[PDB]
Design an enzyme around this catalytic site. Sequence first.
Site, PDB file in Angstrom:
ATOM      1  N   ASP A   1     -22.117   7.785 -22.110  1.00  0.00           N
ATOM      2  CA  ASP A   1     -22.405   7.062 -20.881  1.00  0.00           C
ATOM      3  C   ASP A   1     -23.778   7.573 -20.473  1.00  0.00           C
ATOM      4  OD1 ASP A   1     -22.312   5.514 -18.555  1.00  0.00           O
ATOM      5  OD2 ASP A   1     -21.363   7.091 -17.363  1.00  0.00           O
TER       6      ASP A   1
ATOM      7  N   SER B   1     -21.757   5.652 -12.203  1.00  0.00           N
ATOM      8  CA  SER B   1     -20.531   6.105 -12.835  1.00  0.00           C
ATOM      9  C   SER B   1     -19.610   6.639 -11.775  1.00  0.00           C
ATOM     10  CB  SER B   1     -20.860   7.206 -13.822  1.00  0.00           C
ATOM     11  OG  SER B   1     -22.050   6.865 -14.511  1.00  0.00           O
TER      12      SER B   1
ATOM     13  N   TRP C   1     -28.076   6.841 -19.648  1.00  0.00           N
ATOM     14  CA  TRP C   1     -29.011   5.911 -19.047  1.00  0.00           C
ATOM     15  C   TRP C   1     -30.361   6.583 -18.788  1.00  0.00           C
ATOM     16  CZ3 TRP C   1     -24.996   8.170 -16.142  1.00  0.00           C
ATOM     17  CH2 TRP C   1     -25.444   9.064 -15.134  1.00  0.00           C
TER      18      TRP C   1
ATOM     19  N   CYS D   1     -22.717  12.308 -20.897  1.00  0.00           N
ATOM     20  CA  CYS D   1     -23.168  11.450 -19.820  1.00  0.00           C
ATOM     21  C   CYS D   1     -24.465  11.961 -19.180  1.00  0.00           C
ATOM     22  CB  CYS D   1     -22.058  11.364 -18.781  1.00  0.00           C
ATOM     23  SG  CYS D   1     -22.439  10.398 -17.324  1.00  0.00           S
TER      24      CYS D   1
HETATM   25  C1  LIG Z   1     -24.604   2.749 -16.943  1.00  0.00           C
HETATM   26  C2  LIG Z   1     -25.397   3.466 -16.054  1.00  0.00           C
HETATM   27  C3  LIG Z   1     -24.826   4.478 -15.290  1.00  0.00           C
HETATM   28  C4  LIG Z   1     -25.576   5.114 -14.305  1.00  0.00           C
HETATM   29  N1  LIG Z   1     -25.001   6.050 -13.536  1.00  0.00           N
HETATM   30  C5  LIG Z   1     -25.706   6.625 -12.551  1.00  0.00           C
HETATM   31  C6  LIG Z   1     -25.113   7.587 -11.741  1.00  0.00           C
HETATM   32  O1  LIG Z   1     -23.900   7.789 -11.794  1.00  0.00           O
HETATM   33  N2  LIG Z   1     -25.893   8.304 -10.826  1.00  0.00           N
HETATM   34  C7  LIG Z   1     -27.269   8.055 -10.728  1.00  0.00           C
HETATM   35  O2  LIG Z   1     -27.977   8.734  -9.985  1.00  0.00           O
HETATM   36  N3  LIG Z   1     -27.854   7.069 -11.530  1.00  0.00           N
HETATM   37  C8  LIG Z   1     -27.068   6.367 -12.450  1.00  0.00           C
HETATM   38  N4  LIG Z   1     -27.594   5.314 -13.091  1.00  0.00           N
HETATM   39  C9  LIG Z   1     -28.991   4.925 -12.784  1.00  0.00           C
HETATM   40  C10 LIG Z   1     -28.985   3.888 -11.658  1.00  0.00           C
HETATM   41  O3  LIG Z   1     -28.377   2.684 -12.131  1.00  0.00           O
HETATM   42  C11 LIG Z   1     -30.392   3.569 -11.142  1.00  0.00           C
HETATM   43  O4  LIG Z   1     -31.256   3.255 -12.238  1.00  0.00           O
HETATM   44  C12 LIG Z   1     -30.978   4.738 -10.347  1.00  0.00           C
HETATM   45  O5  LIG Z   1     -30.091   5.115  -9.291  1.00  0.00           O
HETATM   46  C13 LIG Z   1     -32.331   4.319  -9.763  1.00  0.00           C
HETATM   47  O6  LIG Z   1     -32.185   3.079  -9.063  1.00  0.00           O
HETATM   48  P1  LIG Z   1     -33.123   2.690  -7.812  1.00  0.00           P
HETATM   49  O7  LIG Z   1     -32.910   1.258  -7.504  1.00  0.00           O
HETATM   50  O8  LIG Z   1     -32.919   3.681  -6.732  1.00  0.00           O
HETATM   51  O9  LIG Z   1     -34.609   2.904  -8.402  1.00  0.00           O
HETATM   52  P2  LIG Z   1     -35.522   1.709  -8.980  1.00  0.00           P
HETATM   53  O10 LIG Z   1     -36.233   1.058  -7.857  1.00  0.00           O
HETATM   54  O11 LIG Z   1     -34.715   0.871  -9.893  1.00  0.00           O
HETATM   55  O12 LIG Z   1     -36.596   2.535  -9.848  1.00  0.00           O
HETATM   56  C14 LIG Z   1     -36.235   3.085 -11.117  1.00  0.00           C
HETATM   57  C15 LIG Z   1     -37.506   3.273 -11.945  1.00  0.00           C
HETATM   58  O13 LIG Z   1     -38.438   4.129 -11.271  1.00  0.00           O
HETATM   59  C16 LIG Z   1     -39.330   4.618 -12.287  1.00  0.00           C
HETATM   60  N5  LIG Z   1     -39.479   6.072 -12.051  1.00  0.00           N
HETATM   61  C17 LIG Z   1     -38.449   6.984 -11.518  1.00  0.00           C
HETATM   62  N6  LIG Z   1     -39.202   8.254 -11.478  1.00  0.00           N
HETATM   63  C18 LIG Z   1     -40.435   8.039 -11.932  1.00  0.00           C
HETATM   64  C19 LIG Z   1     -41.443   8.897 -12.066  1.00  0.00           C
HETATM   65  N7  LIG Z   1     -41.249  10.116 -11.572  1.00  0.00           N
HETATM   66  N8  LIG Z   1     -42.620   8.546 -12.602  1.00  0.00           N
HETATM   67  C20 LIG Z   1     -42.801   7.227 -13.029  1.00  0.00           C
HETATM   68  N9  LIG Z   1     -41.719   6.352 -12.888  1.00  0.00           N
HETATM   69  C21 LIG Z   1     -40.568   6.776 -12.343  1.00  0.00           C
HETATM   70  C22 LIG Z   1     -38.659   4.323 -13.621  1.00  0.00           C
HETATM   71  O14 LIG Z   1     -39.228   3.139 -14.201  1.00  0.00           O
HETATM   72  C23 LIG Z   1     -37.222   4.056 -13.213  1.00  0.00           C
HETATM   73  O15 LIG Z   1     -36.612   3.177 -14.169  1.00  0.00           O
HETATM   74  C24 LIG Z   1     -26.894   4.733 -14.077  1.00  0.00           C
HETATM   75  C25 LIG Z   1     -27.472   3.739 -14.861  1.00  0.00           C
HETATM   76  C26 LIG Z   1     -26.725   3.105 -15.847  1.00  0.00           C
HETATM   77  C27 LIG Z   1     -27.304   2.095 -16.608  1.00  0.00           C
END
Ligand SMILES: Cc1cc2nc3c(=O)[nH]c(=O)nc-3n(C[C@H](O)[C@H](O)[C@H](O)COP(=O)(O)OP(=O)(O)OC[C@H]3O[C@@H](n4cnc5c(N)ncnc54)[C@H](O)[C@@H]3O)c2cc1C
EC number: 1.6.2.4
Length: 607
Positions: free
Chosen positions: A604, A387, A606, A559
Amino acid sequence: SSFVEKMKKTGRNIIVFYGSQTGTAEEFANRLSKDAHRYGMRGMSADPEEYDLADLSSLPEIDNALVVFCMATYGEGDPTDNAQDFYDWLQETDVDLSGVKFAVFGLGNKTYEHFNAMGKYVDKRLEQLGAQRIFELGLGDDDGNLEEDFITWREQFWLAVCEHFGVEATGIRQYELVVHTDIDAAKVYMGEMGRLKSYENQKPPFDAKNPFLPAVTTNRKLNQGTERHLMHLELDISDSKIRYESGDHVAVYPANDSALVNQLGKILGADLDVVMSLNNLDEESNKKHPFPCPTSYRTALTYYLDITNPPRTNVLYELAQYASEPSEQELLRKMASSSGEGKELYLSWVVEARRHILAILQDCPSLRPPIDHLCELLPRLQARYYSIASSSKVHPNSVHICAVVVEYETKAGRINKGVATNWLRAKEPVGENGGRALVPMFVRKSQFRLPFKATTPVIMVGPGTGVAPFIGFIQERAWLRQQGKEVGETLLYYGCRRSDEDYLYREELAQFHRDGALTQLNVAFSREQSHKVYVQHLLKQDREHLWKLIEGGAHIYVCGDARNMARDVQNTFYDIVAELGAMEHAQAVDYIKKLMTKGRYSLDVWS
Ligand SMILES: Cc1cc2nc3c(=O)[nH]c(=O)nc-3n(C[C@H](O)[C@H](O)[C@H](O)COP(=O)(O)OP(=O)(O)OC[C@H]3O[C@@H](n4cnc5c(N)ncnc54)[C@H](O)[C@@H]3O)c2cc1C
Ligand SMILES: Cc1cc2nc3c(=O)[nH]c(=O)nc-3n(C[C@H](O)[C@H](O)[C@H](O)COP(=O)(O)O)c2cc1C
């Protein structure tokens, strides 16, 4: 081009359309498509955008025709962009679909307001038009385990198919490998999405297929503590023609951990630098390659494939054939079972343990599959949405991000790192002699927006990173006040663990309140006393004023965490409306839900 004719000329009787934004529905349709074969039928999957669904009335011209829809639901119970044309058609058409036989499997998440709205609408609409439902609507819930919902549905689907059509289960690589040895490094994909050299030679307009390469001007840690890492980045989009508003999202194409990629190569005994191409065996398909080709394995595993997410059941099944140890193969094979101990182990050993592909290859040593087949099985690496934490009225040439790094320990004793957040964390800001770091992104419009009227008050609830769009909201409201315009009250309900551990934008927020821009700053510290104090608590305490603003026409915005926060905050708002509006609880629910349709209660969230 009529998808029905396409089906006639390629001998197919089954067509599975997919409405997908991040590939899941698309993968589900491809799996259903390949399944036809085991029943004497021939299927194909298709992007409805590349066709015209009005042609469904011509489906009866194919013997034993059957159409299946795999549809994901997005913003406010809306369809994905590639299914929008389809949606619009269904709403205005009144065509007789007698003779059309269909089935729908919707992909959704019950933590959202309109659960599986898309799937529900398509399924309900085809029946209204006369189509014959061959099997019940599937309600896939990504808050539980979509994969299990899918295989469960899939199984019952085919049985219904066998029953109605009278077929039976009679009881395969999609791509073929071509090693490019004499290739010019100049004709090799190095991680760009879309056309070759699109990164090296940037030209607008930039979108999901042609991401802009911005310069990271800032990348600073926001939290005082050290338990976690919360960062604030600023991406310079000057010369991109790109527009956005506070509320919009920025999507980014990340890169996997170099170390993780290197380990995968080593454990598979494969030179990752070999350049190659994977060509679709289906001469008729549009999808010539699973990802940009030719390209080296290293590049594929770094920019194009998902190697961190816990593998779905079909991927564990195919891999089984490469595990020589007996007990290790038995384990992988059963993981694809509908239920029983196979389903239990999957949920347990794969999902809950959060084992990525490398962890699987390590905990199943006998498994030694060829790297090229794996590249065909693995999902495409998706972009991550954030966001925008900036207002285009103040920073028209920059896009701001606020994010929490994802890092945790697994039951499997390993340490999992979030793909996009660890990647973003390592981006070095432009230096006096620095090196442009590549952060491939594009903007995604949303419905989240400040009121049309600056005078309209705004109630913002965003604990943790959920505070993100509001930083931009407050930036713009200040700017408006500076523009001499009248601005209604601007209240922020923020929350975190402790004022000395992870209070984000503390200085910026305090200054905004001093300038008069931020009318009220209300922060809930969930860990500075025995009992947890959350934002909904602060909302209740202020029931009187909030109700007044609400009754006056104020806009509410929520959000952040969808799983719990959103649910508790909405419940409190029901409470406020019921108690002070004097109405019944169920009336307050009606009331609040009606604000959503009027655009005055925006979300908003997630997880
Ligand atoms: C519309 C929307 C808006 C968003 N806005 C933001 C934002 O503004 N700021 C922000 O920080 N994020 C936001 N996100 C989330 C962001 O898109 C990512 O999902 C987040 O940053 C993690 O991505 P990554 O690739 O670093 O982790 P990934 O490699 O994608 O891993 C994520 C997954 O790790 C697993 N996980 C995380 N912690 C644990 C745990 N402790 N124990 C077990 N499983 C766990 C979960 O399955 C989680 O889904 C938003 C998501 C959406 C959909
Ligand atoms: C920005 C965003 C909005 C979503 N909105 C909804 C929604 O309104 N209703 C719902 O049931 N699921 C919603 N979901 C969940 C998706 O429908 C679910 O994750 C689906 O599996 C995604 O499929 P895809 O990868 O094929 O796009 C949303 C997901 C994201 C990321």
